[PDB]
Amino acid sequence: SGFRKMAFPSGKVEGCMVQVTCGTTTLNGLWLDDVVYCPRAVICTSEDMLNPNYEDLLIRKSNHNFLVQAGNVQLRVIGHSMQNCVLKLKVDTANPKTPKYKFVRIQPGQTFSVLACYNGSPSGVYQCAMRPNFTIKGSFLNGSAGSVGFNIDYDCVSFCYMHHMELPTGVHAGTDLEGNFYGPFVDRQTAQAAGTDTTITVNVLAWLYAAVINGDRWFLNRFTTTLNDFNLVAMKYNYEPLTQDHVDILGPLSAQTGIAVLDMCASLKELLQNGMNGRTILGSALLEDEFTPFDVVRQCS
């Protein structure tokens, strides 16, 4: 019993974190086998961060311009290339701590753990979600670029996020591990703004199911709704549309609790209109949307 924002154990990722320095710029790198992955903005100069020409900047670099430090050990860079917004530094040593891993590009609404690091060393681990507007609501300071987000379902570390920048609203933007940004963002300090964010409806419903599984039913009601009527209401509260895919995805939690998906939708409609009137759900006084249907099953009985 209980329900917490639960991250994956971070040790498999901790053993991959390194510090990358180029000139006076330092950030974190991800050392897997004999490649160190890091944001290509490590090659920018403090002067030209509005319109860097990364191809031009990279061709002026030698392998020995990259200082890569794993703990107190300096790794020798023997090659380098750029893939989209990520730099790949080939090193002469394969990381003996490399876990089984893969790279995955996630969809908005998906969650993952973040190992926030500075100077190649971990500071903490927390759960995050890819927002509908392709930002993440992280906790990151200067020097955190190159920190990664990941899941570890079963034995395999799936890397899905590498941190690059902070937007003016204080939320974050970054790439997959192939260097493609999530969202319309670019690795430039030019003015960029996150679009309006919305609530991840299928996650809210998953979390209400977690509440019922943990023995709370006060917010259920006798009503059901249609999918289209629910979406008309949900939009008015800046909730994401619920698709038939989402309905299908909730099938398991629906079976475990005996509450049909569209019955739970009618309960969410009423919660949006009434609020919680001083009660809480799973210890929260607002509707939580960073637990996926899969997360709930992972955590609950």
């Binding site: 006076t24 902070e166 690795d187 430039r188 300090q189």
Partner: peptide, 8 residues
Amino acid sequence: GVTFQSAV
């Protein structure tokens, strides 16, 4: 107000 989060 967009900031790379490297450190310098």
